[PDB]
Amino acid sequence: AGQEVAAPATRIPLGTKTLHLVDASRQDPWKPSAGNRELMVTLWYPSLPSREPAAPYVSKPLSRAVLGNDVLAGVRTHAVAGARPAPVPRPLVVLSPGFGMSRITLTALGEDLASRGYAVAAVDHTYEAPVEFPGGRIEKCTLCDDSRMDPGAVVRNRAKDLRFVLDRLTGPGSELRVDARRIGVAGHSIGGASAVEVMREDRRVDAAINLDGNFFTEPPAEGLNKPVLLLGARRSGLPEPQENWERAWKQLTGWKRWLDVPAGGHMTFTDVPWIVDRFGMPGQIPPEQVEGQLGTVSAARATAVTRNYVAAFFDRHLRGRPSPLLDRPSSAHPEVTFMK
Numbered sequence: 001a002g003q004e005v006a007a008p009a010t011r012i013p014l015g016t017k018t019l020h021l022v023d024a025s026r027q028d029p030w031k032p033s034a035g036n037r038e039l040m041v042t043l044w045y046p047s048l049p050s051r052e053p054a055a056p057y058v059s060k061p062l063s064r065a066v067l068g069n070d071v072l073a074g075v076r077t078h079a080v081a082g083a084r085p086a087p088v089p090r091p092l093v094v095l096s097p098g099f100g101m102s103r104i105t106l107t108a109l110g111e112d113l114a115s116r117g118y119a120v121a122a123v124d125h126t127y128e129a130p131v132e133f134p135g136g137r138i139e140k141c142t143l144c145d146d147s148r149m150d151p152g153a154v155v156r157n158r159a160k161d162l163r164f165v166l167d168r169l170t171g172p173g174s175e176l177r178v179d180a181r182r183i184g185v186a187g188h189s190i191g192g193a194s195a196v197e198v199m200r201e202d203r204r205v206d207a208a209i210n211l212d213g214n215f216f217t218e219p220p221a222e223g224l225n226k227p228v229l230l231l232g233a234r235r236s237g238l239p240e241p242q243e244n245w246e247r248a249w250k251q252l253t254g255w256k257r258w259l260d261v262p263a264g265g266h267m268t269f270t271d272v273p274w275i276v277d278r279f280g281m282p283g284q285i286p287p288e289q290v291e292g293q294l295g296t297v298s299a300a301r302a303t304a305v306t307r308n309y310v311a312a313f314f315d316r317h318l319r320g321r322p323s324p325l326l327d328r329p330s331s332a333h334p335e336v337t338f339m340k
Contacts, residue, residue, distance in 0.1 A: 001075065003075050003076070004075060004078065005076070005078065006108045006300070006303045006304075007078075008078055008114070009116050009307065009311070012115055012117075013048065013083065014044060014079035014083070014111060014114050015044070015045050015080055015084070015085060016082075016083075017042075017043045017081070017082060017176065018043070019041040020039075020133060020134050021038065021040075021041060021168055023036060023039070023160075023164045025164075029157045030126075030127040037160075038126055039126060039165065041103075041121050041124070041165060042103055042107075042121070043119070043121055044111050044122075045085050045114055046115075048083060048084045048086060054079060054080055055076075056074075056075065056077070057072050057076065058073055058075075059073060061132065066104070067284075068281060069281070071279050072275065079114065090118055090178060090179055091181075091182030091184070091318045092119045092120070092121065092170075092179070092182070093119070093120050093121070093184045093314055094120075094165060094185045095110055095187060096122075096125070096158060096162065096187035096188070097129065097270070098187075099128060099154065099189060100141050102131070105188075105271045106271065107122075108307070109307060110122050112307040112311065116311050117319075123165055125158055125161055126139055127139060127140075127142045127143050128141060128143050151193075151216040152217050155190065155193050155194050155197050155216050155217050156217060158190070158194035158198070161194075162185065162194065162198040166204055182319075183204050183206050183318075184205070184207045184314045185208050185209075186211065187213065188212065189211070189213040189266065192209065193210060193214065193216055197217055200224050205226070206227070207226065207318065208228050209228075209229045209231060209310060209313055209314075210231070211231050211306070212231065212232045212233050212235075212268075214244045215244060219247075219251035220251065222253075223252065224252055224253065227254060227255040227313075228252050228254070228255070228256050228257075229256075229257050229259070229309070230248070230256070230257065230258040231259045231269065231310075232258075232259070232260050232339075233260070233268050233269070234260075234261075234263075234292070234295065235262075236260050236262040237262065249340065258340045259336055260339050261335050261337075263295045263296045263335060264295045264296075264302065264335065265292055265297070266293050267294055269306045274303060276299075278299065304333075
């Protein structure tokens with residue numbers, strides 16, 4: 001193949017580690033018979049140079065579980081497994097995927113943020129996606145098959161997942177030393193609502209991005225005065241999602257922006273456009289769903305818009321860097337509109 005994830009913003013060397021974390025303070029909320037809440041996490045970070053080849057996107061078994069076949073195992077990333085971290089502890093961005101979707105689907109965003117100088121942690125929430133644990137154990141999205149799934153509950157328990165990841169990563173003998181003074185959280189769809197929710201619950205979190213997830217939990221009565229970017233797809237012409245973000249907008253009382261990608265899809269903010277366009281089986285997404293999930297924004301543009309607007313948000317709030325992308329239309333990104 002020689003096929004790779006989209007080229008990251010810079011050429012600094014990147015490392016990656018995968019962590020199996022077990023939160024022994026909580027029983028698993030969805031499958032308590034399995035015992036404690038465990039999480040798989042992927043780290044991406046500025047590293048020292050390595051001559052080792054870069055890690056694969058995914059194993060053969062997890063590619064089968066995610067896509068239906070092993071093709072994505074042939075795709076390489078740009079981060080070297082186990083590389084020694086660069087010297088200065090870096091600001092942390094924690095990432096959470098869409099419901100039913102693997103954390104690997106935020107690899108292009110994660111690597112790009114790492115190449116811009118962030119420590120990045122993408123988090124899988126067990127039984128809410130296919131997830132690979134040590135010893136080849138693959139757990140399935142068992143909640144995907146349940147009409148009794150409450151999305152508010154998912155958000156509340158994901159808030160607890162992410163607070164625990166912060167405890168591990170900011171704590172003594174963290175596997176990666178990070179600058180705990182500067183913490184951002186972003187997520188896709190329900191992970192995006194979860195990103196805002198954990199910021200609401202956790203003082204350590206400084207700024208949050210919701211990439212196109214409806215809110216499912218009731219707001220705080222006084223409001224949330226920390227920085228939030230709402231970045232959606234097709235909400236200019238979807239009444240119920242727009243209304244949902246209209247309700248959320250009035251209870252955001254600090255720095256805030258609401259951006260839309262009218263011709264994009266729900267999956268524009270992930271690796272899925274690139275996965276489907278380059279490696280999709282015929283009908284990978286049913287013909288009728290393509291408008292809603294991908295729209296017309298190409299894999300390249302989906303990846304670049306997401307990276308550039310996510311980085312601009314975190315650079316603004318964590319690294320003291322301005323960006324005109326956050327304040328007015330960009331002729332380099334005609335796909336992006338301002339809703340407020």
